[PDB]
Each structure stands twice: as C-alpha cells, then as structure tokens.
Design a protein around this ligand. Structure first.
Ligand SMILES: O[C@@H]1[C@@H](O)[C@H](O[C@@H]2CNC[C@H](O)[C@H]2O)OC[C@H]1O
Length: 302
C-alpha cells in the first residue's frame, strides 16, 4: 500500500493524474497537494488551440511550457490536451472552412507536437467529435463540415509528427455502454482499426452527474474498447457531489481492465473545479481530503 494516489496507482503500473492550471501555480496549497498526490498532469487550458496558436502560424508556448515544466520538475508525465476540437478555437481558425481549415488543422497538430516531440506520453488528438442524444451523429463544427475524414486525417498527421506518443480520441457521455454516443465512438474506433488509421487510446472524460450518471456498465465499455486494440484512460473524472462509493466504483473499473492506463481527475480542490458548485473532486476547498479521496486510495491499494 501507498499513501498517495499516484504512488498507489503505480503499484499496478498505472498513474493517477490531475488537470493543472497555470494561474494556480502561485498557490502554495495547490502546488504542494498536487505535487504530492499526482504522477500525471494534463494542462487544463494551456495546450489548447487558442492558447498555443493565438494567430495562424504564430505559436505561444509560454503557458503550456509553464505547466509542462512544473509537471516534469515535480516528477509527473504529461498528457497533451488537445489538438483538434470545435471548442476554444481562436477566432482565426473559426473563420476557416474546408481545405483552408484542413491545412490549418494539420499545421496546428504538426507545430504543437513538434514542440513537445518525445515528451508527451498521450495526446488527445481529437476531442468531442460526437453529438449528444440518440443519433450517434458527428457534432456540427467547421472541422466536421470539412469532411468525415477530419478525424482520421488528424490522427495520421499526429502519428507522423510524433511516432512515440500514444494517440487518443477523447469524449464525454461515452461511458455508458447502452448510450448511442458510446456506440458511435465504438463504431469509429473499430472502423479506424480496420482501415489502418493510427489510434492507440480512447479517453473517457468521465464527467459524471445526475443527467449523465455513472453506470456499472462502464467496466463493459472499457473492456469492449480494450478488445479493439486500444488502451483506455479515464481523462477528466469528476462526480457531482463526490460520492465516495461512485469514486471507488470508477477506480475499481479501471483496475479491472488491463488496458486501462490510469485515471486523471479534472482538478485538485473542489474550488479549482470548472464545476466547483457541484463539489465534484477529491479535496476540500481547504485542501483537506474528502471521503471520496479515501475511497479512491483504498481501491488503488486493494
Ligand atoms: O477551465 C475550463 C476547463 O476546465 C474546461 O475543460 C474542458 C472540460 N470539458 C471537456 C474538455 O475536454 C476540457 O478541456 O474547458 C473550459 C475551461 O473554461
């Protein structure tokens, strides 16, 4: 047994990560608890398209590198998040469509991945490409309107840019095996594997709440994606109300699936959360451990 989340995960070769925000890196409580507890970091915003390429062709890695360097100085690996996405696009990219957008998408992938080549264990190459609801359709965006192949092109680009990185597709509302969105993502990954599209991993954001609740069948989802020949990762876990039982359940689903790489929670203290009103994380506002912390640690320790 181990006394911290990352170390406990590492006993089985897994990680326990968090999202890190550069604007919080002057908060001594934040940096010390995050430093102690996690062995994997995702930048909460700093590696997104707008942050890294604020004008076309003009990269700015200052905030991204602050997060990256904090991670490596503190003994963590890094998940890169995210290269191609409808959200948080800079204005210049929102104005592009079709072939011009395709070139810009490719250029963005190449430039960001080159900056971090060999340094990033997993990239969320593509984020949130499916619609919610019963259709299983692709989400509408400039990217999708450029062609159904946008996603595969992004992956092929990423494979060439950094052959050392695990290339992940990341999404939410894809945890429940019975949901249409989950099935759409399953069919995509299966199709990609069958056609030689390079994809190594699927990220389950795992933003569980009353409208999109955890189900025990998450384990079935994880198993079934693993059986396609991809790793699986829980990438942005948070749970409305931070119920200890649900947190243990998710943890045990990862531990039960050999291809589950690890778990990232989407922030440190409840007050750091993008959904702080839902108190959905493992640490209280004052940095103390919640009941859910103990349930996760105990699960990681068997
Ligand atoms: O600061 C928030 C940030 O937490 C949020 O992160 C996204 C949550 N939804 C899924 C995405 O994959 C995450 O990047 O993005 C919006 C920011 O304002």
């Amino acid at each position: 047994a181990e006394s911290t989340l990352g170390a406990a995960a590492a006993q089985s070769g897994r990680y326990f990560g968090t999202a890190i925000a550069s604007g919080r890196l002057s908060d001594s409580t934040y940096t010390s608890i995050a430093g102690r507890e996690f062995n994997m970091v995702t930048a909460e915003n700093e590696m997104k398209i707008d942050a890294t390429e604020p004008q076309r062709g003009q990269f700015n890695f200052s905030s991204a590198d602050r997060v990256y360097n904090w991670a490596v100085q503190n003994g963590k690996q890094v998940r890169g998040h995210t290269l191609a996405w409808h959200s948080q696009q800079p204005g210049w990219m929102q104005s592009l469509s079709g072939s011009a957008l395709r070139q810009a998408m490719i250029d963005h992938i190449n430039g960001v991945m080159a900056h971090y080549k060999g340094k990033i264990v997993q990239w969320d190459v593509v984020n949130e490409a499916f619609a919610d609801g019963s259709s299983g359709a692709r989400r509408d965006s400039n990217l999708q309107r450029s062609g159904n192949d946008w996603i595969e092109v992004a992956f092929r680009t990423a494979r060439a840019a950094d052959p050392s990185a695990k290339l992940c597709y990341n999404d939410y509302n894809v945890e429940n095996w019975t949901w249409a969105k989950t099935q759409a993502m399953y069919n995509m990954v299966r199709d990609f594997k069958q056609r030689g599209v390079p994809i190594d991993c699927v990220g389950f954001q795992s933003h569980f709440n009353s409208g999109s609740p955890y189900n025990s069948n998450f384990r079935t989802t994880l198993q079934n994606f693993a059986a396609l020949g991809v790793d699986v990762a829980i990438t942005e876990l948070d749970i409305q109300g931070a119920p200890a039982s649900t947190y243990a359940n998710v943890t045990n689903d990862c531990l039960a699936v050999s291809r589950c790489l690890g778990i990232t929670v989407w922030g440190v203290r409840d007050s750091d959360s993008w959904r702080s009103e839902q108190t959905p994380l493992l640490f209280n506002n004052d940095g103390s451990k919640k009941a859910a912390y103990t349930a996760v640690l105990d699960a990681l320790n068997g």
